[PDB]
């Protein structure tokens, strides 16, 4: 039942969207980050400065240790825990309980950071990313088996206030217009093929392989749109050619001072739209997801102020091109694993002052680009 899952996420892009889960017997309530960039279900198993609560295995009558540990490493951090299995209930969606693999984290580095509200992670990518190996069945694979739901989930983020994780399919109330689908190129991360980037209607004229050079992925656990260094350089170069920054004058004499704005004035009309072209399921065709400045020039301040400060929502990557939460905030995103495709549709919740912050259009021709842009 998909309607019961609407608004089951809390949080924001910056510190994560998270789903509430009840684990073990009696039920311990935890707050789980929704991460399409990893494949383990792992929760705090001991106190940590940046978490409120943790899962205590010794208090669940149903917990079973599987007799091995697990470790995860990524760019600037890592975590280690024990592996077992236990019963989980998802209050918003799945009132029946099911048995899942769980890693209980006892040690970590740059994983639980100050500012977060989650104390665990639900990795929704493929088994091939699971640690210690792909044989540790994924949470969503377990759910599919045990609840007999379709091998499809979709995500809407309304931080551009929470969002929705629909497990088992698509909820029609969460989009308008048509879903466009792009093939999953490799089933590990959710890797898709980017054909072209466009800044204010002007294409970057990089070899399309530059966008996929390592990989282009859809990652709800990354905050920003992250771009390989070369693509980043081209993007910000194009943004500077197309933008119209005010000139220095009375009360505005450094670049830094461009950050904050008073009297309802916003920086948006000074900035260009950004478009990513993805190949359609039909090879000859592509479609294009667009983000307006409303999405990548992001507000910063706590409530109750009469001014706003903003941050640029795009950053360099060393390897992956990451379609992070920045971008996913503009769209309803369907992870159709059953059919090896990712879908995008316009979110109606993705509006500012009743005006759209993102666009999706197609078809466009793919005649002028290589048949495969993934090197």
């Amino acid at each position, epitope marked *: 039942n998909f309607l019961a899952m609407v608004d089951n996420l809390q949080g924001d892009s910056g510190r994560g969207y998270y789903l509430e889960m009840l684990i073990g017997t009696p039920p311990q309530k935890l707050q789980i980050l929704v991460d399409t960039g990893s494949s383990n279900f792992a929760v705090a198993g001991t106190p940590h400065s940046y978490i409120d609560t943790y899962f205590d295995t010794e208090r669940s009558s149903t917990y079973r240790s599987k007799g091995f540990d697990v470790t995860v490493k990524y760019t600037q951090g890592s975590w280690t825990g024990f592996v077992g299995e236990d019963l989980v209930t998802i209050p918003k969606g799945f009132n029946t309980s099911f048995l899942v693999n769980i890693a209980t984290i006892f040690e970590s580095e740059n994983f639980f950071l100050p500012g977060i509200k989650w104390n665990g992670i639900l990795g929704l990518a493929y088994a091939t990313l699971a640690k210690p190996s792909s044989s540790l069945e994924t949470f969503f694979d377990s759910l599919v088996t045990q609840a007999n739901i379709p091998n499809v989930f979709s995500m809407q983020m309304c931080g551009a206030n929470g969002g929705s994780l629909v497990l088992g399919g698509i909820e029609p109330s969460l989009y308008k217009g048509d879903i466009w689908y792009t093939p999953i190129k490799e089933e590990w991360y959710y890797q898709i093929e980017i054909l072209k980037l466009e800044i204010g209607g002007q294409s970057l004229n990089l070899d399309c392989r530059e966008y996929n050079a390592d990989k282009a992925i859809v990652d709800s656990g990354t905050t920003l749109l992250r771009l390989p260094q070369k693509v980043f350089d081209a993007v910000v170069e194009a943004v500077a050619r197309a933008s119209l920054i005010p000139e220095f004058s*009375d009360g505005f004499w*450094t670049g830094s001072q461009l950050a904050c704005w008073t009297n309802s004035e916003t920086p948006w009309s000074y900035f260009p739209k950004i478009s990513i072209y993805l190949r359609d399921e039909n090879s000859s065709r592509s479609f294009r997801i667009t983000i307006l400045p409303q999405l990548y020039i992001q507000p910063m301040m706590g409530a109750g102020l009469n001014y706003e400060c903003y941050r640029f929502g795009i950053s360099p990557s060393t390897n992956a091109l990451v379609i992070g939460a920045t971008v996913m905030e503009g769209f309803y995103v369907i992870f159709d694993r059953a059919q090896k495709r990712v879908g995008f549709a316009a979110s109606p919740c993705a509006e500012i002052a009743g005006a759209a912050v993102s666009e999706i259009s197609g078809p466009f021709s793919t005649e002028d680009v290589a048949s495969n842009c993934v090197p």
Partner: antibody, heavy 116, light 112 residues
Framework: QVQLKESGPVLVAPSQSLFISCTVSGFSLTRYGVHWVRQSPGKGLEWLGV???????NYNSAFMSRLTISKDNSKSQVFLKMNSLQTDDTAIYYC??????????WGQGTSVTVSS | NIVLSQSPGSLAVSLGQRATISCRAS??????????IHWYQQKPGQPPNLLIH???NLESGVPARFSGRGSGTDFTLTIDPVEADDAATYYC?????????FGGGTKLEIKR
């Protein structure tokens, strides 16, 4: 045609005060800021400060204890005054027209020597 | 104070060849994805003169032989192909923060 012309004392004794005028032409001080910049072998180019269209001044904080910039819109002039001169204030002093987020037109510069 | 460090201090390049000169800032000069750093040419006996606005926008009337790149803390000016008239010192200047600062400059020698 935009033009800026500096006029200062070619020579001034230490401790004494420096006063330079900048007479501008081809643009209005009611529409553009004017910056002051100096250049010396020992310190290279230093941005001293600026006076904007509306008369707001912003200064290089290293100089604020002794530097005053001002202008007279009706005389098309901008003024620099600096106190407590030292020999390493010896430099070419430029007035420069504000432009976008940088500077476009410079005067030819006036040579100032601080010594007795 | 953001400090700008140019390298090399001096460079000799043959007519028709490529000159590449670097500017490193001590702190990021970027806001809103724009780099508040600018390139000036100073020919002997003249004041400096703006060539590139905001890291990479070629000023109107400056030849297409000049181009600027970079973001964050690392910027380059490239002159290509180099001409005789290009004998001068080149300066970067930042104003992401106050005071506005200039780098120590790079003298381009034409290697005739």
């Amino acid at each position: 045609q935009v033009q800026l012309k500096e006029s200062g004392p070619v020579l001034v004794a230490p401790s004494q005060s420096l006063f330079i005028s900048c007479t501008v032409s081809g643009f209005s001080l009611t529409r553009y800021g004017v910056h002051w910049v100096r250049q010396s072998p020992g310190k290279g180019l230093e941005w001293l400060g600026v006076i904007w269209a509306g008369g707001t001044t912003n200064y290089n904080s290293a100089f604020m204890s002794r530097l005053t910039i001002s202008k007279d819109n009706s005389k098309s002039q901008v003024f620099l005054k600096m106190n407590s001169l030292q020999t390493d204030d010896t430099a070419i002093y430029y007035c420069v027209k504000a432009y976008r987020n940088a500077m476009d037109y410079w005067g030819q510069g006036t040579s100032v020597t601080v010594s007795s | 104070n953001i400090v700008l460090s140019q390298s090399p201090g001096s460079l000799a390049v043959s007519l028709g060849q490529r000159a590449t000169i670097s500017c490193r800032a001590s702190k990021s000069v970027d806001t809103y994805g724009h780099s508040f750093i600018h390139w000036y040419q100073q020919k002997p006996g003249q004041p400096p003169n703006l060539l590139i606005h905001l890291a990479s926008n070629l000023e109107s009337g400056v030849p297409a032989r000049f181009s600027g790149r970079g973001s964050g803390t690392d910027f380059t000016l490239t002159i290509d192909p180099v001409e005789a008239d290009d004998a001068a010192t080149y300066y970067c200047q930042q104003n992401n923060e106050d005071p506005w600062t200039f780098g120590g400059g790079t003298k381009l020698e034409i290697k005739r």
